[PDB]
């Protein structure tokens, strides 16, 4: 997985999450 | 204990223990402020605020007198903030690992642990603007001092002596702790002229405590603080903890969090070295 | 009980009762239409539709005859709609309340409880276009009347008696109720120079069932309605109810819902004072 | 019991109850603000501060959607103040009462019980500068109105209806309460020649929750307040209480104390009739 791209401070909280670009690839041994 | 708080979590008890151990291990190395600062005991979830008393700055006679004399305390109130970070997993990989009898991987949580530690350190050193919590370099009456060139002639020892002199005059003695930028930390290994020893060895004798470097400071700067209780303290509400959010689709999201605040009673126990150019 | 029906809920059985009391008390003070209209019994969840029969346009002897009488039913079918509103509750304060044993705060629910009642009033007064159910203002054969110039004293009583005569001529003699706009309410309750007449004591005698003010009516308008079980009724499938949506993030979302419908059997009862032509 | 808590006290357990009854009865007749404002429950001694969230500036379908709504909280923190007053009781008369078995006299307490209530009323109406808590008169976004020349008949009603229209245009329709100055109270209750109009019967109909007179307001001023749990509330940590200071000389000193605070959630509810510009 190649992301190819900070913590949050709040009082009440947050209603959402954060994600990133997986860009999955396959390799052989 | 686990699997009762989160019945719907796919992970089992042993996997949860491994996840917690991996999370704490990364933060253990990164945390640096707690080395020379004490900590208040966990207060539970009952309190969301704390009270701090700031002291900005006799009676020799025969038996007698009927009176009481007290000094002002400048009472103030504070609010505890919250910091959090999150990560995600997948289901097909877990199924494949269970089928092949291979242990699960929890690499992602390390990034979140590092990021939250790097924010806790910055909040301790520089403070928070929203809640108006002062930082170590922002308190009033911080007894500043100015530095000079450290490249040649070994003026570092004289600067340290002069900095300690002001605290000695202000009657603050005992153990001291010095934190400086990596650039200044490197130069201390130069040889001391006419003695032929390293100046760091001479400085350690005066300091009598650990000397460390932190990445939070960017420019050439340093701080020397007298170390004891009743001068400064750290109050924690909840330690590092991990929770499992409600599942969406087929994947599973998690989050980490912790709550901590800082209090400084005596502003005159600290001294800050400033570069003339800065 | 509510607790068994809704697991994974921080609120307990006792707190559910307190929430219900607040919701119903908030609805009671803002529910206006219920005063002059009776209620059909709670049908249940078995049916989603009702049938309405529209009616439009005794002998004294020693021994009775064998005759019977019938009318035109004109049966029609109506569906039952649904109304709802939602609110949210934060954590980190519910935990504090549990720790300190103090009672919980439920002030938020009243805001939604008022809005749902307002929407119900609007639906009753003006009707719904999606389900093509009729309303009081737009019903057919409403026996309209025209009024004007309520400023000068003595004009309102003449218009009221004129409307009452029209209602009487159609063999409808019974208690009447009056609903007026807020603007006309102020004109009724007004001080007239050189005459000093309250002008409502005379009117209150004839109406005998009440004059009310409704904010739904925007302009200058009013309605006079005969009160009876036969003329009109209101059918309720389920009353105000509260549900727990789920667990997003770490907070708790709730919803409130209600179902209701109205049936008008005899259109001729209602009389409407149309707005002035100008 | 009070006796075990306070030893070295001439007063007994029965006399403590009689003292409490007198104090509460004296407070009841002079406590004005309590009538149109509800009360928060007794929190306890656990907390010294409260949090206030400021709010400033329904769908009908067969199946509900999945959307939710939120607003701006803007949480703020408020501390709980304290008020007190004290009185003294002489000896050589308490002994006589004990000897003759006659009941004891407790007339003094009422004087302090009145003054503490007066101070509480002043704090509610105008606020405190030391703790920078807002008051009704100086709150932001109060939707002021201007009035003048109440001498001639019929002017007051127009101003009242004008204020009511301004309150209505902001989607605030509910019971209203009115508080006026003693000077304006006399002008309202006045005899007008050649017209003989009481001029309060018309006004009493619209307000529907009461018109009151308060001595705190010095000049010509008045307030119209919408009544509801959501709009405003009052929080009490501890109610009226009595304590025994000690034993100076041979007499006995006592003290009475109370704690209270006020929270205004929606500023737009209040409307103020500003004093005449002249």
PDB file of N, CA and C in Angstrom, chain B residues 41-120:
ATOM      1  N   UNK B  41      -1.939  12.703  40.230  1.00  0.00           N
ATOM      2  CA  UNK B  41      -2.622  11.436  40.120  1.00  0.00           C
ATOM      3  C   UNK B  41      -3.883  11.533  39.285  1.00  0.00           C
ATOM      4  N   UNK B  42      -4.287  10.419  38.675  1.00  0.00           N
ATOM      5  CA  UNK B  42      -5.507  10.424  37.853  1.00  0.00           C
ATOM      6  C   UNK B  42      -6.724  10.838  38.667  1.00  0.00           C
ATOM      7  N   UNK B  43      -7.470  11.805  38.139  1.00  0.00           N
ATOM      8  CA  UNK B  43      -8.600  12.387  38.844  1.00  0.00           C
ATOM      9  C   UNK B  43      -9.935  11.753  38.479  1.00  0.00           C
ATOM     10  N   UNK B  44      -9.963  10.843  37.509  1.00  0.00           N
ATOM     11  CA  UNK B  44     -11.215  10.298  37.026  1.00  0.00           C
ATOM     12  C   UNK B  44     -11.894  11.232  36.046  1.00  0.00           C
ATOM     13  N   UNK B  45     -13.131  10.882  35.703  1.00  0.00           N
ATOM     14  CA  UNK B  45     -13.926  11.674  34.773  1.00  0.00           C
ATOM     15  C   UNK B  45     -14.811  12.699  35.471  1.00  0.00           C
ATOM     16  N   UNK B  46     -14.727  12.804  36.797  1.00  0.00           N
ATOM     17  CA  UNK B  46     -15.604  13.710  37.519  1.00  0.00           C
ATOM     18  C   UNK B  46     -15.340  15.174  37.221  1.00  0.00           C
ATOM     19  N   UNK B  47     -14.077  15.536  37.016  1.00  0.00           N
ATOM     20  CA  UNK B  47     -13.674  16.932  36.902  1.00  0.00           C
ATOM     21  C   UNK B  47     -13.344  17.277  35.456  1.00  0.00           C
ATOM     22  N   UNK B  48     -13.818  18.441  35.008  1.00  0.00           N
ATOM     23  CA  UNK B  48     -13.442  19.010  33.719  1.00  0.00           C
ATOM     24  C   UNK B  48     -12.679  20.321  33.868  1.00  0.00           C
ATOM     25  N   UNK B  49     -12.404  20.751  35.099  1.00  0.00           N
ATOM     26  CA  UNK B  49     -11.718  22.012  35.351  1.00  0.00           C
ATOM     27  C   UNK B  49     -10.849  21.886  36.594  1.00  0.00           C
ATOM     28  N   UNK B  50      -9.866  22.785  36.699  1.00  0.00           N
ATOM     29  CA  UNK B  50      -8.922  22.800  37.809  1.00  0.00           C
ATOM     30  C   UNK B  50      -8.641  24.248  38.198  1.00  0.00           C
ATOM     31  N   UNK B  51      -8.205  24.439  39.445  1.00  0.00           N
ATOM     32  CA  UNK B  51      -7.900  25.757  39.990  1.00  0.00           C
ATOM     33  C   UNK B  51      -6.417  25.848  40.319  1.00  0.00           C
ATOM     34  N   UNK B  52      -5.794  26.960  39.932  1.00  0.00           N
ATOM     35  CA  UNK B  52      -4.370  27.186  40.133  1.00  0.00           C
ATOM     36  C   UNK B  52      -4.142  28.527  40.818  1.00  0.00           C
ATOM     37  N   UNK B  53      -3.190  28.559  41.748  1.00  0.00           N
ATOM     38  CA  UNK B  53      -2.845  29.762  42.500  1.00  0.00           C
ATOM     39  C   UNK B  53      -1.449  30.220  42.099  1.00  0.00           C
ATOM     40  N   UNK B  54      -1.325  31.489  41.721  1.00  0.00           N
ATOM     41  CA  UNK B  54      -0.075  32.053  41.226  1.00  0.00           C
ATOM     42  C   UNK B  54       0.461  33.035  42.258  1.00  0.00           C
ATOM     43  N   UNK B  55       1.680  32.791  42.731  1.00  0.00           N
ATOM     44  CA  UNK B  55       2.380  33.710  43.623  1.00  0.00           C
ATOM     45  C   UNK B  55       3.409  34.469  42.794  1.00  0.00           C
ATOM     46  N   UNK B  56       3.119  35.738  42.495  1.00  0.00           N
ATOM     47  CA  UNK B  56       4.009  36.513  41.633  1.00  0.00           C
ATOM     48  C   UNK B  56       5.371  36.715  42.286  1.00  0.00           C
ATOM     49  N   UNK B  57       5.383  37.056  43.570  1.00  0.00           N
ATOM     50  CA  UNK B  57       6.629  37.273  44.297  1.00  0.00           C
ATOM     51  C   UNK B  57       6.389  37.270  45.803  1.00  0.00           C
ATOM     52  N   UNK B  58       9.595  36.725  59.417  1.00  0.00           N
ATOM     53  CA  UNK B  58       8.993  37.922  59.994  1.00  0.00           C
ATOM     54  C   UNK B  58       8.483  37.648  61.402  1.00  0.00           C
ATOM     55  N   UNK B  59       7.976  38.697  62.053  1.00  0.00           N
ATOM     56  CA  UNK B  59       7.397  38.597  63.388  1.00  0.00           C
ATOM     57  C   UNK B  59       8.398  38.048  64.399  1.00  0.00           C
ATOM     58  N   UNK B  60       9.455  38.809  64.681  1.00  0.00           N
ATOM     59  CA  UNK B  60      10.453  38.449  65.684  1.00  0.00           C
ATOM     60  C   UNK B  60      10.235  39.331  66.906  1.00  0.00           C
ATOM     61  N   UNK B  61       9.691  38.749  67.970  1.00  0.00           N
ATOM     62  CA  UNK B  61       9.385  39.489  69.189  1.00  0.00           C
ATOM     63  C   UNK B  61       9.108  38.481  70.300  1.00  0.00           C
ATOM     64  N   UNK B  62       8.674  38.978  71.456  1.00  0.00           N
ATOM     65  CA  UNK B  62       8.341  38.103  72.567  1.00  0.00           C
ATOM     66  C   UNK B  62       6.985  37.442  72.339  1.00  0.00           C
ATOM     67  N   UNK B  63       6.643  36.515  73.234  1.00  0.00           N
ATOM     68  CA  UNK B  63       5.365  35.819  73.137  1.00  0.00           C
ATOM     69  C   UNK B  63       4.221  36.823  73.214  1.00  0.00           C
ATOM     70  N   UNK B  64       3.209  36.616  72.387  1.00  0.00           N
ATOM     71  CA  UNK B  64       2.077  37.515  72.360  1.00  0.00           C
ATOM     72  C   UNK B  64       1.502  37.612  70.962  1.00  0.00           C
ATOM     73  N   UNK B  65       0.704  38.665  70.772  1.00  0.00           N
ATOM     74  CA  UNK B  65       0.119  39.071  69.495  1.00  0.00           C
ATOM     75  C   UNK B  65      -1.085  38.203  69.167  1.00  0.00           C
ATOM     76  N   UNK B  66      -2.139  38.814  68.610  1.00  0.00           N
ATOM     77  CA  UNK B  66      -3.371  38.111  68.258  1.00  0.00           C
ATOM     78  C   UNK B  66      -3.850  38.610  66.888  1.00  0.00           C
ATOM     79  N   UNK B  67      -3.333  37.992  65.828  1.00  0.00           N
ATOM     80  CA  UNK B  67      -3.637  38.408  64.466  1.00  0.00           C
ATOM     81  C   UNK B  67      -3.099  37.362  63.501  1.00  0.00           C
ATOM     82  N   UNK B  68      -3.614  37.396  62.274  1.00  0.00           N
ATOM     83  CA  UNK B  68      -3.186  36.500  61.209  1.00  0.00           C
ATOM     84  C   UNK B  68      -2.889  37.314  59.957  1.00  0.00           C
ATOM     85  N   UNK B  69      -1.778  36.997  59.297  1.00  0.00           N
ATOM     86  CA  UNK B  69      -1.353  37.680  58.082  1.00  0.00           C
ATOM     87  C   UNK B  69      -1.178  36.661  56.964  1.00  0.00           C
ATOM     88  N   UNK B  70      -1.825  36.914  55.825  1.00  0.00           N
ATOM     89  CA  UNK B  70      -1.771  36.033  54.666  1.00  0.00           C
ATOM     90  C   UNK B  70      -1.395  36.863  53.441  1.00  0.00           C
ATOM     91  N   UNK B  71      -1.035  36.168  52.363  1.00  0.00           N
ATOM     92  CA  UNK B  71      -0.651  36.796  51.108  1.00  0.00           C
ATOM     93  C   UNK B  71      -1.587  36.346  49.993  1.00  0.00           C
ATOM     94  N   UNK B  72      -1.763  37.213  48.996  1.00  0.00           N
ATOM     95  CA  UNK B  72      -2.697  36.941  47.910  1.00  0.00           C
ATOM     96  C   UNK B  72      -2.218  35.778  47.048  1.00  0.00           C
ATOM     97  N   UNK B  73      -3.175  35.102  46.413  1.00  0.00           N
ATOM     98  CA  UNK B  73      -2.894  33.891  45.661  1.00  0.00           C
ATOM     99  C   UNK B  73      -3.231  33.991  44.179  1.00  0.00           C
ATOM    100  N   UNK B  74      -4.011  34.989  43.761  1.00  0.00           N
ATOM    101  CA  UNK B  74      -4.344  35.204  42.353  1.00  0.00           C
ATOM    102  C   UNK B  74      -4.962  33.949  41.736  1.00  0.00           C
ATOM    103  N   UNK B  75      -6.135  33.588  42.248  1.00  0.00           N
ATOM    104  CA  UNK B  75      -6.802  32.371  41.810  1.00  0.00           C
ATOM    105  C   UNK B  75      -7.248  32.484  40.356  1.00  0.00           C
ATOM    106  N   UNK B  76      -7.099  31.383  39.613  1.00  0.00           N
ATOM    107  CA  UNK B  76      -7.475  31.311  38.206  1.00  0.00           C
ATOM    108  C   UNK B  76      -7.996  29.908  37.910  1.00  0.00           C
ATOM    109  N   UNK B  77      -8.713  29.779  36.791  1.00  0.00           N
ATOM    110  CA  UNK B  77      -9.377  28.537  36.413  1.00  0.00           C
ATOM    111  C   UNK B  77      -8.947  28.102  35.016  1.00  0.00           C
ATOM    112  N   UNK B  78      -8.925  26.785  34.792  1.00  0.00           N
ATOM    113  CA  UNK B  78      -8.461  26.189  33.546  1.00  0.00           C
ATOM    114  C   UNK B  78      -9.421  25.094  33.095  1.00  0.00           C
ATOM    115  N   UNK B  79      -9.370  24.780  31.800  1.00  0.00           N
ATOM    116  CA  UNK B  79     -10.192  23.733  31.196  1.00  0.00           C
ATOM    117  C   UNK B  79      -9.290  22.704  30.529  1.00  0.00           C
ATOM    118  N   UNK B  80      -9.600  21.426  30.726  1.00  0.00           N
ATOM    119  CA  UNK B  80      -8.800  20.321  30.197  1.00  0.00           C
ATOM    120  C   UNK B  80      -9.133  20.053  28.732  1.00  0.00           C
ATOM    121  N   UNK B  81      -8.150  20.077  27.835  1.00  0.00           N
ATOM    122  CA  UNK B  81      -8.409  19.756  26.426  1.00  0.00           C
ATOM    123  C   UNK B  81      -8.328  18.261  26.145  1.00  0.00           C
ATOM    124  N   UNK B  82      -8.675  17.905  24.907  1.00  0.00           N
ATOM    125  CA  UNK B  82      -8.689  16.520  24.447  1.00  0.00           C
ATOM    126  C   UNK B  82      -7.977  16.402  23.104  1.00  0.00           C
ATOM    127  N   UNK B  83      -7.154  15.364  22.956  1.00  0.00           N
ATOM    128  CA  UNK B  83      -6.434  15.085  21.718  1.00  0.00           C
ATOM    129  C   UNK B  83      -6.731  13.661  21.269  1.00  0.00           C
ATOM    130  N   UNK B  84      -6.909  13.467  19.960  1.00  0.00           N
ATOM    131  CA  UNK B  84      -7.302  12.166  19.438  1.00  0.00           C
ATOM    132  C   UNK B  84      -6.709  11.929  18.055  1.00  0.00           C
ATOM    133  N   UNK B  85      -6.609  10.650  17.690  1.00  0.00           N
ATOM    134  CA  UNK B  85      -6.165  10.221  16.371  1.00  0.00           C
ATOM    135  C   UNK B  85      -6.747   8.840  16.092  1.00  0.00           C
ATOM    136  N   UNK B  86      -6.852   8.493  14.806  1.00  0.00           N
ATOM    137  CA  UNK B  86      -7.594   7.312  14.381  1.00  0.00           C
ATOM    138  C   UNK B  86      -6.853   6.546  13.291  1.00  0.00           C
ATOM    139  N   UNK B  87      -7.242   5.279  13.122  1.00  0.00           N
ATOM    140  CA  UNK B  87      -6.704   4.405  12.086  1.00  0.00           C
ATOM    141  C   UNK B  87      -7.759   3.373  11.702  1.00  0.00           C
ATOM    142  N   UNK B  88      -7.522   2.685  10.582  1.00  0.00           N
ATOM    143  CA  UNK B  88      -8.497   1.762  10.010  1.00  0.00           C
ATOM    144  C   UNK B  88      -7.819   0.445   9.648  1.00  0.00           C
ATOM    145  N   UNK B  89      -8.625  -0.612   9.551  1.00  0.00           N
ATOM    146  CA  UNK B  89      -8.185  -1.963   9.216  1.00  0.00           C
ATOM    147  C   UNK B  89      -9.020  -2.497   8.045  1.00  0.00           C
ATOM    148  N   UNK B  90      -8.900  -3.799   7.778  1.00  0.00           N
ATOM    149  CA  UNK B  90      -9.640  -4.446   6.700  1.00  0.00           C
ATOM    150  C   UNK B  90     -10.048  -5.847   7.136  1.00  0.00           C
ATOM    151  N   UNK B  91     -10.904  -6.488   6.334  1.00  0.00           N
ATOM    152  CA  UNK B  91     -11.461  -7.780   6.732  1.00  0.00           C
ATOM    153  C   UNK B  91     -10.870  -8.958   5.958  1.00  0.00           C
ATOM    154  N   UNK B  92     -10.627  -8.787   4.657  1.00  0.00           N
ATOM    155  CA  UNK B  92     -10.094  -9.888   3.861  1.00  0.00           C
ATOM    156  C   UNK B  92      -8.709 -10.298   4.342  1.00  0.00           C
ATOM    157  N   UNK B  93      -7.874  -9.322   4.703  1.00  0.00           N
ATOM    158  CA  UNK B  93      -6.541  -9.641   5.203  1.00  0.00           C
ATOM    159  C   UNK B  93      -6.613 -10.415   6.512  1.00  0.00           C
ATOM    160  N   UNK B  94      -7.516 -10.015   7.411  1.00  0.00           N
ATOM    161  CA  UNK B  94      -7.675 -10.744   8.665  1.00  0.00           C
ATOM    162  C   UNK B  94      -8.125 -12.175   8.409  1.00  0.00           C
ATOM    163  N   UNK B  95      -9.069 -12.361   7.483  1.00  0.00           N
ATOM    164  CA  UNK B  95      -9.522 -13.713   7.173  1.00  0.00           C
ATOM    165  C   UNK B  95      -8.393 -14.557   6.593  1.00  0.00           C
ATOM    166  N   UNK B  96      -7.595 -13.980   5.691  1.00  0.00           N
ATOM    167  CA  UNK B  96      -6.481 -14.722   5.110  1.00  0.00           C
ATOM    168  C   UNK B  96      -5.461 -15.108   6.174  1.00  0.00           C
ATOM    169  N   UNK B  97      -5.164 -14.188   7.095  1.00  0.00           N
ATOM    170  CA  UNK B  97      -4.208 -14.490   8.156  1.00  0.00           C
ATOM    171  C   UNK B  97      -4.733 -15.582   9.081  1.00  0.00           C
ATOM    172  N   UNK B  98      -6.027 -15.541   9.407  1.00  0.00           N
ATOM    173  CA  UNK B  98      -6.603 -16.597  10.234  1.00  0.00           C
ATOM    174  C   UNK B  98      -6.555 -17.941   9.522  1.00  0.00           C
ATOM    175  N   UNK B  99      -6.799 -17.946   8.211  1.00  0.00           N
ATOM    176  CA  UNK B  99      -6.758 -19.197   7.461  1.00  0.00           C
ATOM    177  C   UNK B  99      -5.346 -19.768   7.400  1.00  0.00           C
ATOM    178  N   UNK B 100      -4.345 -18.909   7.216  1.00  0.00           N
ATOM    179  CA  UNK B 100      -2.962 -19.357   7.081  1.00  0.00           C
ATOM    180  C   UNK B 100      -2.234 -19.489   8.414  1.00  0.00           C
ATOM    181  N   UNK B 101      -2.894 -19.172   9.530  1.00  0.00           N
ATOM    182  CA  UNK B 101      -2.294 -19.275  10.864  1.00  0.00           C
ATOM    183  C   UNK B 101      -1.050 -18.397  10.980  1.00  0.00           C
ATOM    184  N   UNK B 102      -1.173 -17.150  10.537  1.00  0.00           N
ATOM    185  CA  UNK B 102      -0.090 -16.172  10.604  1.00  0.00           C
ATOM    186  C   UNK B 102      -0.523 -15.057  11.550  1.00  0.00           C
ATOM    187  N   UNK B 103       0.356 -14.557  12.419  1.00  0.00           N
ATOM    188  CA  UNK B 103      -0.048 -13.492  13.345  1.00  0.00           C
ATOM    189  C   UNK B 103      -0.412 -12.201  12.625  1.00  0.00           C
ATOM    190  N   UNK B 104      -1.354 -11.468  13.225  1.00  0.00           N
ATOM    191  CA  UNK B 104      -1.881 -10.248  12.622  1.00  0.00           C
ATOM    192  C   UNK B 104      -0.857  -9.121  12.730  1.00  0.00           C
ATOM    193  N   UNK B 105      -0.994  -8.125  11.854  1.00  0.00           N
ATOM    194  CA  UNK B 105      -0.106  -6.969  11.799  1.00  0.00           C
ATOM    195  C   UNK B 105      -0.860  -5.719  12.234  1.00  0.00           C
ATOM    196  N   UNK B 106      -0.217  -4.897  13.063  1.00  0.00           N
ATOM    197  CA  UNK B 106      -0.806  -3.669  13.585  1.00  0.00           C
ATOM    198  C   UNK B 106       0.145  -2.491  13.410  1.00  0.00           C
ATOM    199  N   UNK B 107       0.703  -2.342  12.208  1.00  0.00           N
ATOM    200  CA  UNK B 107       1.743  -1.341  11.987  1.00  0.00           C
ATOM    201  C   UNK B 107       1.196   0.080  12.068  1.00  0.00           C
ATOM    202  N   UNK B 108      -0.059   0.285  11.661  1.00  0.00           N
ATOM    203  CA  UNK B 108      -0.554   1.641  11.434  1.00  0.00           C
ATOM    204  C   UNK B 108      -0.593   2.455  12.725  1.00  0.00           C
ATOM    205  N   UNK B 109      -0.869   1.809  13.863  1.00  0.00           N
ATOM    206  CA  UNK B 109      -1.087   2.545  15.108  1.00  0.00           C
ATOM    207  C   UNK B 109       0.152   3.334  15.528  1.00  0.00           C
ATOM    208  N   UNK B 110       1.328   2.924  15.048  1.00  0.00           N
ATOM    209  CA  UNK B 110       2.557   3.620  15.408  1.00  0.00           C
ATOM    210  C   UNK B 110       2.540   5.066  14.928  1.00  0.00           C
ATOM    211  N   UNK B 111       2.007   5.308  13.727  1.00  0.00           N
ATOM    212  CA  UNK B 111       1.944   6.672  13.211  1.00  0.00           C
ATOM    213  C   UNK B 111       1.081   7.557  14.102  1.00  0.00           C
ATOM    214  N   UNK B 112      -0.077   7.045  14.527  1.00  0.00           N
ATOM    215  CA  UNK B 112      -0.962   7.811  15.398  1.00  0.00           C
ATOM    216  C   UNK B 112      -0.301   8.096  16.740  1.00  0.00           C
ATOM    217  N   UNK B 113       0.387   7.097  17.301  1.00  0.00           N
ATOM    218  CA  UNK B 113       1.068   7.309  18.575  1.00  0.00           C
ATOM    219  C   UNK B 113       2.138   8.389  18.453  1.00  0.00           C
ATOM    220  N   UNK B 114       2.944   8.330  17.389  1.00  0.00           N
ATOM    221  CA  UNK B 114       3.968   9.349  17.184  1.00  0.00           C
ATOM    222  C   UNK B 114       3.346  10.731  17.040  1.00  0.00           C
ATOM    223  N   UNK B 115       2.253  10.831  16.278  1.00  0.00           N
ATOM    224  CA  UNK B 115       1.649  12.134  16.025  1.00  0.00           C
ATOM    225  C   UNK B 115       1.062  12.737  17.296  1.00  0.00           C
ATOM    226  N   UNK B 116       0.415  11.922  18.136  1.00  0.00           N
ATOM    227  CA  UNK B 116      -0.163  12.472  19.362  1.00  0.00           C
ATOM    228  C   UNK B 116       0.936  12.856  20.350  1.00  0.00           C
ATOM    229  N   UNK B 117       2.031  12.083  20.393  1.00  0.00           N
ATOM    230  CA  UNK B 117       3.137  12.458  21.270  1.00  0.00           C
ATOM    231  C   UNK B 117       3.769  13.775  20.830  1.00  0.00           C
ATOM    232  N   UNK B 118       3.941  13.963  19.518  1.00  0.00           N
ATOM    233  CA  UNK B 118       4.521  15.207  19.027  1.00  0.00           C
ATOM    234  C   UNK B 118       3.626  16.412  19.269  1.00  0.00           C
ATOM    235  N   UNK B 119       2.327  16.216  19.480  1.00  0.00           N
ATOM    236  CA  UNK B 119       1.442  17.318  19.837  1.00  0.00           C
ATOM    237  C   UNK B 119       1.420  17.577  21.333  1.00  0.00           C
ATOM    238  N   UNK B 120       1.494  16.520  22.145  1.00  0.00           N
ATOM    239  CA  UNK B 120       1.580  16.708  23.590  1.00  0.00           C
ATOM    240  C   UNK B 120       2.841  17.476  23.968  1.00  0.00           C
TER     241      UNK B 120
END
